[PDB]
Amino acid sequence: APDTSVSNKQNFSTDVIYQIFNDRFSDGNPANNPTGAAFDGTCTNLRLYCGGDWQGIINKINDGYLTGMGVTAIWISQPVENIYSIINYSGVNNTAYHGYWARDFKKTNPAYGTIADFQNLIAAAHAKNIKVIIDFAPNHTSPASSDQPSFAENGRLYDNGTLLGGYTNDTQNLFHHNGGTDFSSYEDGIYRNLYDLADLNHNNSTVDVYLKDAIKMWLDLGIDGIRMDAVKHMPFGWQKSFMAAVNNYKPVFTFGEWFLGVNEVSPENHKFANESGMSLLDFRFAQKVRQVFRDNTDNMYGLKAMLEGSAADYAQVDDQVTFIDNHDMERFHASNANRRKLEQALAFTLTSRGVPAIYYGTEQYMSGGTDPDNRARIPSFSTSTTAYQVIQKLAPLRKSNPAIAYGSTQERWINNDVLIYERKFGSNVAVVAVNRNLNAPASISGLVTSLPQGSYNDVLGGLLNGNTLSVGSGGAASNFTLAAGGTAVWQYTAATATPTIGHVGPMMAKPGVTITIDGRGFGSSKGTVYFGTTAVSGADITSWEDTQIKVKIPAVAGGNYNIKVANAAGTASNVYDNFEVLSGDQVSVRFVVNNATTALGQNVYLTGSVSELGNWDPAKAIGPMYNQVVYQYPNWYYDVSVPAGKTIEFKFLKKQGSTVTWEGGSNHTFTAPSSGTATINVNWQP
């Protein structure tokens, strides 16, 4: 199958995601609507159930609303059973219409539908070439009060009907009892409760095994991807073990929500996306887009800096899920704002690197403040808005033009208000010109592109006042006027003769797992696949065609490898780096080291005899470790994904920058559990 097939669960870069808030999209089955004080069919009270469900999504899939827009993937609300409690917050009733208050991860939320309804949704979506992504929130269950168990459902967790436990009298330690986070540090936001939500303890074997078994059920139901909720609030090491469980079973594209504020650039964020096994929602991209196109707090130079910076900071920038707003932000379109701002932001997002995600209703110019005002019922299913047409014209380009799906990004022209950038991949090019200034046109002279000489019509057909481009010798465009609020897209596509890798997924797994290598020019006959210097050919290459290769990971030692392929003739492709071969199945283990004193700025790290611990390379040590919540300095702790049942030798380090101080004495040693979790507690050896 081609890289663009709906069957490709490892690659969403050629897709356009439509984020659906189930309850506020379409009520296709009134029979499953909650009743009484938990329901408002008019959807005037945005804190109660409005009725939107899976049958509604099926109907909108079947009547062409999404297909006609060019949407090829949908991200829906967490499908698991939520609490049925109506929570009163200072005189205001609240329900779990949003789906983020889970009580049983192995059952469906009856308001959305039954297991059968879910199966029909997967079927209907796939029949229309639409992939299905489910939200999944394993950080917590629901709102709870430790000393007032009558509140809500006490964050109670069930396993397919069987009660596991609640927040009160939690003798099993299924949850954290470290108070609430003040967001002062990553550790604080991870091991303390997010608001009043019962924080799940992933170091508890029951919780660990339970959640991994749960995701497997959904994977068996045929989902194509996962949107992980609040990943900044769960142990990064546990999450790596979670992604390993997914990838070593049935890998699907996974991205997490790591909120970033305006002007925030987080090294920890980059590291997570680069080493966790999942990518992230691109808040850096979203916040900068809002600054430039919505709020006028930065200009095109800032947009350019974000593009060049993110391309350098993310190992796989093409896996980051871009957006201009969501359910936790004020709607991009302000009621009294010029609609061109939203239209440009959309055009920019749809033609930029990564995986574009559109919040439902954006195409209908929905406006609204913060939660819950940004979650109104979609007011119309019109295909005639300019925004709908913008998506309709550009979304399909991610399928037809690989430069947009996998291309590099290069600024070709720029000033305060204008940015003209070029996407390029193999013998494919896309050039996009955007003038955010709504009152002043720009004179574009000196523009040079990789487009072959000739005339190029605006793909948008002048919808956003774009113009035809005249390209002369060497790719130099003749002078032209970029209209006020002008946005234009020009492109060139042709067959690529040389092997070119545009994407690889999953990027982390154990030997034997099948990965997907997508691109152009691979040829029709099986070639060779390289993991570092190791060559793979023949039987282990399950299938091979010009745009997609399916190949089993070779039994090489755990570590980081560069991926490259060569066609049957022997011509090598470009290198796609940072692929991690795991040492085997993974388990989450907490390491604790006692009395490890440091000076301010100096932190303790973990190193060891397996790639999961960096194979004794300090530059690849695990950390910085924590020392505030679960354990207190001079004691440090950290949760780490390690190979199951393996005997591992390890030592702790004290690092400041790249300067490292090693533990003295002999290596510590232990054997990782075959399943579930474990805690290894040792003393720092001078």
Ligand X SMILES: OC[C@H]1O[C@H](O[C@H]2[C@H](O)[C@@H](O)[C@@H](O)O[C@@H]2CO)[C@H](O)[C@@H](O)[C@@H]1O
Ligand Y SMILES: OC[C@H]1O[C@H](O[C@H]2[C@H](O)[C@@H](O)[C@H](O)O[C@@H]2CO)[C@H](O)[C@@H](O)[C@@H]1O
Ligand Z SMILES: OC[C@H]1O[C@H](O[C@H]2[C@H](O)[C@@H](O)[C@@H](O[C@H]3[C@H](O)[C@@H](O)[C@H](O)O[C@@H]3CO)O[C@@H]2CO)[C@H](O)[C@@H](O)[C@@H]1O
Ligand U SMILES: OC[C@H]1O[C@H](O)[C@H](O)[C@@H](O)[C@@H]1O
Residues annotated as binding site? 27, 29, 32-33, 51, 53, 100-101, 139-140, 145-147, 190, 193-196, 199, 227, 232-233, 315, 327, 371, 375, 577
* Binding map of Ca ion across residues 202-241, x = CB under 5 A, - = no contact: -------------------------------x--------
Q: Are 320 and 314 in contact (CB under 8 A)?
A: yes
Binding-site residue positions for substrate: 100-101, 140, 145-147, 193-196, 227, 232-233, 327, 371, 375
What CA–CA distance (Å, rounded) separates 449 from 425? 13
Told to check if 662 binds ligand Z by CB under 6 A, we report yes
What CA–CA distance (Å, rounded) separates 517 from 512? 15
Nearest Cα residue to 237 out of 518, 619, 605, 600 = 605
Q: Which of 257, 325, 417, 458 is catalytic?
A: 257
Q: Which residue's entry shows tokens 């069919």?
A: 41
Phi and psi at residue 188, to the nearest 5°:
-65, -40
* Binding map of ligand X across residues 374-413, x = CB under 6 A, - = no contact: -------------------------------------xxx
Told to check if 98 binds ligand Y by CB under 6 A, we report yes
**CA–CA distances in Å: residue 112 to residues 55, 102, 121, 293, 656:** 8, 13, 11, 35, 51
Angle at which helix 386-394 crosses helix 339-351, to 10 degrees, equals: 10
Q: Partners of 640 in the beta sheet?
A: 589
> Which segment (257-265, 285-293, 478-486, 551-559) binds ligand X by CB under 6 A?
257-265
Phi and psi at residue 417, to the nearest 5°:
-105, -15
Q: Are 214 and 244 in contact (CB under 8 A)?
A: no
Amino acid letter, residue 663: E
Q: Closer to ligand X at the Cβ: 405 or 420?
A: 420
What CA–CA distance (Å, rounded) separates 585 from 509? 8
Told to check if 310 binds Ca ion by CB under 5 A, we report no
- Which residue's CB comes closest to ligand X? 446
**CA–CA distances in Å: residue 572 to residues 119, 543, 643:** 42, 18, 33
Told to check if 199 binds Ca ion by CB under 5 A, we report yes
* Binding map of ligand X across residues 440-479, x = CB under 6 A, - = no contact: -----xx-x-------------------------------
Residue 257 bears catalytic tag: yes
Q: Closer to ligand Z at the Cβ: 465 or 628?
A: 628
The SS3 of residue 346 is: helix
Using CB under 6 A as the binding rule, the residues of this chain from 281 to 340 that contact ligand U are: 287, 290, 294-295, 329-330
Q: Are 409 and 317 in contact (CB under 8 A)?
A: no
Q: Are 9 and 131 in contact (CB under 8 A)?
A: yes
Told to check if 528 binds ligand Z by CB under 6 A, we report no
Q: Closer to ligand U at the Cβ: 6 or 329?
A: 329
* Of the candidate residues 628, 661, 673, 683, the single one contacting ligand Z (CB under 6 A): 628
**CA–CA distances in Å: residue 202 to residues 212, 393, 496:** 11, 45, 47
What CA–CA distance (Å, rounded) separates 292 from 191? 35
H or E stretch including 56?
A: helix 54-62
Q: Residue 198: CA atoms inside 13 Å, Cβ hemisphere, count?
A: 30
* Of the candidate residues 308, 328, 373, 617, the single one contacting ligand Y (CB under 6 A): 328
* Of the candidate residues 602, 670, 678, 683, the single one contacting ligand Z (CB under 6 A): 602
The SS3 of residue 205 is: helix
Residue 600 interacts with, from ligand Z, ligand X, ligand Y, none (CB under 5-8 Å by kind): ligand Z
The SS3 of residue 482 is: strand
* Binding map of ligand X across residues 163-192, x = CB under 6 A, - = no contact: --------------------x---------
* Of the candidate residues 261, 474, 538, 657, the single one contacting ligand U (CB under 6 A): 261
Q: Which residue's entry shows tokens 């089955």?
A: 29
| Rounded least distance, CB 601 to ligand Z, Å | 5
Residue 224 bears catalytic tag: no
Told to check if 178 binds ligand Z by CB under 6 A, we report no
Residue 124 interacts with, from Ca ion, ligand U, ligand Z, none (CB under 5-8 Å by kind): none
Which segments of 98-143 does DSSP mark as H helices, in order?
A: 115-127
Q: Which of 40, 153, 229, 458 is catalytic?
A: 229
H or E stretch including 197?
A: strand 197-199
What CA–CA distance (Å, rounded) separates 640 from 622? 8
Residue 330 interacts with, from ligand Z, ligand X, ligand U, none (CB under 5-8 Å by kind): ligand U
Q: Which residue's entry shows tokens 């290598």?
A: 517
How buried is residue 658: exposed, middle or buried, by Cβ count under 10 Å (0-12/13-18/19+)? exposed
Give me the residues that bind ligand U (CB under 6 A), please.
261-262, 287, 290, 294-295, 329-330
Give me the residues that bind ligand Y (CB under 6 A), please.
98, 100, 137, 143, 195, 197, 229-230, 257, 327-328, 371
Give me the residues that bind ligand X (CB under 6 A), please.
183, 230, 232, 257, 259, 261, 328, 411-415, 445-446, 448
**Any idea which residues carry the catalytic annotation?**
229, 257
Give me the residues that bind ligand Z (CB under 6 A), please.
598-603, 616, 627-628, 633, 651, 662, 664, 667
Give me the residues that bind Ca ion (CB under 5 A), please.
27, 29, 32-33, 51, 53, 139, 199, 233, 315, 577
